Amino acid sequence: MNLTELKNTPVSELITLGENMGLENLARMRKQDIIFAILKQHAKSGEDIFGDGVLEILQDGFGFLRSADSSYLAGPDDIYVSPSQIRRFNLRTGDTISGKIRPPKEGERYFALLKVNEVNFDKPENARNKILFENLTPLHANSRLRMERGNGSTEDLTARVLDLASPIGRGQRGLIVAPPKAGKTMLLQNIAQSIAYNHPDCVLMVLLIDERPEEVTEMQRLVKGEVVASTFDEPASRHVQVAEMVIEKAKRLVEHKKDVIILLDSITRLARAYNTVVPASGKVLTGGVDANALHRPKRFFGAARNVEEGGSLTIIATALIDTGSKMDEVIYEEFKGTGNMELHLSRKIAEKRVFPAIDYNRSGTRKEELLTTQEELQKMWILRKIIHPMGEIDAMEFLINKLAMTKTNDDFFEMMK
Amino acid sequence: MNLTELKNTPVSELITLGENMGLENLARMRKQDIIFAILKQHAKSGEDIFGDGVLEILQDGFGFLRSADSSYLAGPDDIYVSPSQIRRFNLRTGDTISGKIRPPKEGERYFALLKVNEVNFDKPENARNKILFENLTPLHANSRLRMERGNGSTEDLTARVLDLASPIGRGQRGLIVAPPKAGKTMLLQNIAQSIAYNHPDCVLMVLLIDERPEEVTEMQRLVKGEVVASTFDEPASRHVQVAEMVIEKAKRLVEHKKDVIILLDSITRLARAYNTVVPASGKVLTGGVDANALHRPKRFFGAARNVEEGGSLTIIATALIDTGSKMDEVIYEEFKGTGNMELHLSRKIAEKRVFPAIDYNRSGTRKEELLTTQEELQKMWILRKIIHPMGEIDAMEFLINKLAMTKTNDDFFEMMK
Amino acid sequence: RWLELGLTDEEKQNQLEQLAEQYDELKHEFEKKLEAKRRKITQGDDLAP
Ligand SMILES: Nc1ncnc2c1ncn2[C@@H]1O[C@H](COP(=O)(O)OP(=O)(O)O)[C@@H](O)[C@H]1O
Ligand SMILES: Nc1ncnc2c1ncn2[C@@H]1O[C@H](COP(=O)(O)OP(=O)(O)O)[C@@H](O)[C@H]1O
Ligand code: BEF
Ligand code: BEF
Ligand SMILES: [Mg+2]
Ligand SMILES: [Mg+2]
């Protein structure tokens, strides 16, 4: 059997599968316990297992292959691999590996890998000959990620407006500055849908950190691809674990010449987590925040770059402002100008209950002539000059009406001429 | 072999060199690990090594010779030297040393220097007879650093305008007061290009502190000489380390009668770093900033001076204003009048999207009759009197048109007569 | 304490450099020996669980 076919099925499927396997009443155990029992029952007939897991190493030396069911945490379904395999096949954290595995043998309690088959969807030949991430040379984005769907429905506005507000490129360092309860959830839903429709080749990744389970399930059933999430049912340990797991997975992918686009929300919660786990170095500043505790979020935002020969790693992270927490204030202050793309959402326009609510004059992209063509850039300049003198609510209503009479951006362009 | 020839080559060159050396698959290790392995393989054939590194001392007594690949940080390529050599050859921090080195011997793990060859590009004779930095006598600049290229291309404006806005002299204490996203990056790119074209004798130095890797690589491939950088992938420790390294390197150079011109960006990030590392002395003022924590930036801005017998140390540092951080405000306040050259950039003109955006009435140089000649000074007076009554956007457009019909400054001068 | 001298490069510099290299190598080897002895005598020994 394969593990992924036990992965993609819901709990009732596992129930009926165990009933087929002639097992005891299994409605009481975790899904992973059911998968473990079913795999043991299947291998008792003299069968081998096929598994797939993202690799993680501790200082203990040996490695663990986690699945996305528990958002890459320890469990009875994860595979244990010896340091010998890591030394031989040149394995490292984040390297997703798929291949033959066996149930735990006499005295064992977790699965063990037999033969590697796909290292990050690649043969071990070129997987061992992998270019290092930090040894690469960053660049800037010329490949323009078109956010327009072209269907022109009622919500597609929030996407097409970005086509004139904040251009998106491969490997862009983007950050959202927004107050709570403004519309960021549906915004990232829209961006994920749009990038999946216009660019289905790039592997989609969404970061749900310190969120509610309803949002978790709503986003795991609406994104057009594999997703990861993390609620607050566990302390900051799970949060930092999933952050490292996803960052090393993206690093290994972009080292394998992949196009990764991570959507993080929200980054202030990741900062709070990294603060809570990291011990105090004896110096604290205003806000009850340690000095070098923000080093991990810094790094996570610095991982975004553009590879020269091929591949990119775009990171679009949302930040929370206007929450009243001065701590959060300082956090945003640390994130003043670290990214080259700013998406500013204001509560003042969202209180007028029109969506989206774009701060055109406050948002923008640095060095944007390298992303789009010349005529599109000139029309962007014209639109910026037209929108600068007016305010924000009137400007938003103007843009909404102009993009409501028209569907594609060329119509609005020629109408602005 | 020489270490610098392993320095200037990219990663693929090291890959093919290791393949020539019959080495294991080395695509997984750092560039410095590859250099270490290649040097070990080369010395296994009975060969000596030639290295070059900037020297740094801790309280431990012994010294470390760092390279510019890691922007002067610890690594497997840095050379370890005993305190005996520092006592004998009168070594100190910032003193770049080149000479014979050997791979680590039995029980060792870093390289060791055998015989010094070039102490700051000088024989040890006059290197031991070095005048002390603080024991020197500061002066003012008469040697005018002409910023005009003479080619008169589309961007050369931003340089030639300084020839009438802010004169540049050797050892000038210059500071830029500018809001984010205004055009400082290309501004310093222009200034570096212009000083390298007009004055290739003076060693160029650019400080990239707390920046993004894309800017790092864009500036390391556009400056006409060796450059140093530092991103936010490490905490303020790396920032303060590179600040001390570069300041001692410049001090040793100007003690060796060199002309150093450092370009720092941005200085507010250096202040934040020095605040984060230095523990609280029990007294804090408004802005969450310690009182004597700014002592290190102060010193760094005070290192600029003009040597009497020969050599100079010019420092041109950029500061960030209009960021909303009151902390930053206070920082700029501490930097109100510490420098004798002010370059004021305003977001109001940059929002009209014309470049450059000079605050002529707010920018200037103190004691400028000692820099240029008499007729040039009189024409500067005439231009200042003509530009004072008018505003800033109209004045900028006027200057742009006047320097657009003409190429060299003499044409604009005679046209203003 | 003032081994530093120099004149008539062609052979004197070579011989003085060789002898200074021998001296510093001997000093470093003896320092390594002393550090190894210190780490050996300061290493705590296991007694019982
Ligand atoms: N494009 C849109 N069309 C209609 N309603 C919207 C749109 N965008 C946001 N809203 C409204 O705004 C609210 C946003 O809720 P929520 O997801 O909690 O915001 P946030 O993403 O800031 O947490 C929703 O209740 C929804 O009714
Ligand atoms: N003199 C100039 N000539 C051409 N383009 C310019 C000039 N000055 C600024 N720009 C444009 O303005 C943008 C400046 O953004 P950036 O340099 O990131 O902000 P900052 O000025 O704060 O560094 C660049 O995309 C650049 O193309
Ligand atoms: F998703 Be809400 F802005 F907390
Ligand atoms: F480079 Be900008 F001033 F953030
Ligand atoms: Mg939301
Ligand atoms: Mg800049």
Swiss-Prot record, chain C:
Signal peptide extent: none
Record PTM N6-acetyllysine, positions in chain: K27
Family, per entry: Belongs to the RNA polymerase beta chain family.
The protein's role, per its UniProt record: DNA-dependent RNA polymerase catalyzes the transcription of DNA into RNA using the four ribonucleoside triphosphates as substrates.
Subunit structure of this chain's protein: The RNAP catalytic core consists of 2 alpha, 1 beta, 1 beta' and 1 omega subunit. When a sigma factor is associated with the core the holoenzyme is formed, which can initiate transcription.
This protein's name: DNA-directed RNA polymerase subunit beta
